[PDB]
């Protein structure tokens, strides 16, 4: 249904990415605040195509783990 | 791959649920801190069966939106 991405790693690195993501605001629907399992950021998209546009446009550090999934 | 659940609603209600979830600690793998789109809590499970055990055991208020999905 609705594609999502999880970016896991250092909170400072994630804060910098979120900053840089603002430059490509049309490539994602929403971005979450930084959370953790009681650092991770969650992003949603309108389609798989938009998700891929996003991943093809933003350079994500090798130290950040990227996971994909879908919300029903 | 790995099933997840999103519980969306009032942060206070979510805090109470997290409290009550501790009583069924074997019904989920992890529970997140409360986040928002820059209130929501995320839960992961080891299988769909565990997820369903969880949903069949915990009473979730009608005012809380429950969404399911999977992380690859």
């Amino acid at each position: 249904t609705t594609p999502i991405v999880h970016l896991k790693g250092d909170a400072n690195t994630l804060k910098c990415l979120r900053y840089r993501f603002k430059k490509h605001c049309t490539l994602y629907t929403a971005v979450s605040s930084t959370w953790h399992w009681t650092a991770i950021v969650t992003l949603t998209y309108d389609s798989e195509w938009q998700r891929d546009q996003f991943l093809s446009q933003v350079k994500i550090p090798k130290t950040i783990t990227v996971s994909t999934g879908f919300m029903s």
Side-chain angles (χ1 to χ4, degrees), chain A residues 5-37 39-60:
Chain A
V5 167
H6 274 187
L7 299 182
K8 185 200 68 178
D10 181 271
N12 291 304
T13 300
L14 288 180
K15 185 166 301 182
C16 183
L17 289 179
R18 188 153 56 208
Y19 165 73
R20 284 151 68 113
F21 289 170
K22 302 300 180 183
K23 310 299 170 53
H24 300 75
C25 50
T26 66
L27 300 183
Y28 61 91
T29 296
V31 60
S32 78
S33 47
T34 303
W35 51 274
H36 56 85
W37 292 124
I40 305 172
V41 168
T42 300
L43 296 97
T44 57
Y45 305 83
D46 285 308
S47 63
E48 285 189 285
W49 176 265
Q50 186 189 50
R51 179 201 60 191
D52 291 349
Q53 292 193 69
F54 180 81
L55 296 178
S56 78
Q57 300 271 67
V58 310
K59 41 194 177 302
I60 297 182

